Write an enzyme that holds these catalytic residues in place. Sequence first.
Site, mmCIF file in Angstrom:
data_model
loop_
_atom_site.group_PDB
_atom_site.id
_atom_site.type_symbol
_atom_site.label_atom_id
_atom_site.label_comp_id
_atom_site.label_asym_id
_atom_site.label_seq_id
_atom_site.Cartn_x
_atom_site.Cartn_y
_atom_site.Cartn_z
ATOM 1 N N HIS A 12 0.771 -1.245 0.000
ATOM 2 C CA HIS A 12 0.000 0.000 0.000
ATOM 3 C C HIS A 12 0.796 1.285 0.000
ATOM 4 C CE1 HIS A 12 -3.501 -2.343 0.177
ATOM 5 N NE2 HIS A 12 -3.151 -2.910 1.311
ATOM 6 N N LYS A 41 -3.942 -9.861 -7.976
ATOM 7 C CA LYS A 41 -4.689 -9.303 -6.866
ATOM 8 C C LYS A 41 -5.774 -8.417 -7.484
ATOM 9 C CE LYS A 41 -4.173 -7.212 -2.278
ATOM 10 N NZ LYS A 41 -4.972 -5.987 -2.178
ATOM 11 N N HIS A 119 -3.873 -3.424 7.521
ATOM 12 C CA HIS A 119 -4.858 -3.735 6.502
ATOM 13 C C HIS A 119 -5.393 -2.428 5.950
ATOM 14 C CE1 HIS A 119 -8.358 -5.872 4.719
ATOM 15 N NE2 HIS A 119 -9.106 -4.905 5.162
ATOM 16 N N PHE A 120 -5.598 -2.383 4.647
ATOM 17 C CA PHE A 120 -6.268 -1.262 4.014
ATOM 18 C C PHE A 120 -7.737 -1.619 3.818
ATOM 19 C CE2 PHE A 120 -5.691 2.787 1.929
ATOM 20 C CZ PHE A 120 -6.838 2.908 1.194
#
Length: 124
Positions: A12, A41, A119-120
């Site tokens: 990210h 992804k 985590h996004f």
Amino acid sequence: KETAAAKFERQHMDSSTSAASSSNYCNQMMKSRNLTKDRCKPVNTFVHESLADVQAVCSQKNVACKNGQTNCYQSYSTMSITDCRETGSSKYPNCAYKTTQANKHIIVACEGNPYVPVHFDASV
Ligand SMILES: [Cl-]
């Protein structure tokens, strides 16, 4: 064993550019972060702010995560981000992505000591 925190940074963080310049950014970045190794992804956001600014989100507005846990945080301010989403025709291993540059709030889940993004969850 990458830590969750390190995985977050790899997936990210892109503090090297202020914004995506070209429509090929996602194609280029998804490959070079090895996010297309075993599969494409499907969705991934890159954040063009300092790591410190992104870590700081863990101290900002506490919100629920999409999964119902309550260790998510929304950035008070917008951030420069790039959303990457796999096109419908994309097929592994020839992964292709739609790049959208934006200025949005980010929502991350935080964990650990130190309490850092792992985590996004979304952008707003
Ligand atoms: Cl994971």
